[PDB]
Structure 1
Amino acid sequence: NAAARLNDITYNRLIQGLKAAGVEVDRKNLADIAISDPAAFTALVDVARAALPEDVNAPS
């Protein structure tokens, strides 16, 4: 949640976009890339932002 809000996304829409893109990384290793490799965490936030739907409040 802290490493997502520096890449201006919430934890709410990060787990949604990773599931919509098919990235099955567990929360242990996703909170260890957040410290030990902050530049590859951003490359995951940019995938969870593209697979997220165009209007997240629109009915599905």
Structure 2
Amino acid sequence: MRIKGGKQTRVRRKKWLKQASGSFGTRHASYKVAKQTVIQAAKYAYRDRRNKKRDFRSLWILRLNAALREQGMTYSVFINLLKKHNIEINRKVLSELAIKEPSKFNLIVQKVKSEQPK
């Protein structure tokens, strides 16, 4: 019983080739280089999901910090005032407010500024 390989190697090879579509030259043509690039690309994608979670936080912090310095308050004290006033809002939504709703963002800063903590 001589089992002969055909359509088994080609199908699993073409899957890797399909994944590595849009690469530079031989990186999409040859199966070997395509397989290496897909594995490396998967590693990159894994690492950059974690790094995206951190980098977008940093960007929101930067935007919020800037929005506060125009009014004379700093980020380091704004978050402290937020905690003492029990207000719980993401820096993402706060930055979205300062870019989309200047009046309501200014309302939040006014309350945290001076109103009695709790």
- Give TM-score scaled by structure 1 length: 0.76
- Give, in whole Å, the separation in 1 of the partners of 2:73 and 2:99: 17
Shift of 1:52: 7.7
**Greater relative contact order (Cα 8 A, min sep 6): structure 1 or 2?**
1
Q: Which has the higher helix share?
A: 2
Which portions of structure 1, spanning 4 or more consecutive aligned residues, are displaced by more than 3 angstroms? none
- Aligned counterparts, 1:1-60, within 5 A: 1-51=65-115
Contact residue 17 and residue 49 of structure 1 kept, 8 A: yes
Identity %: 36
Contact residue 20 and residue 51 of structure 1 kept, 8 A: no
**Count of paired positions:** 53
Can you give the 5+ residue segments of structure 2 that lack an aligned partner in the other structure?
1-64
Cα RMSD between the aligned structures?
A: 1.8
Contact residue 16 and residue 52 of structure 1 kept, 8 A: no
- Give, in whole Å, the separation in 2 of the partners of 1:5 and 1:52: 22
Can you give the 5+ residue segments of structure 1 that lack an aligned partner in the other structure?
54-60
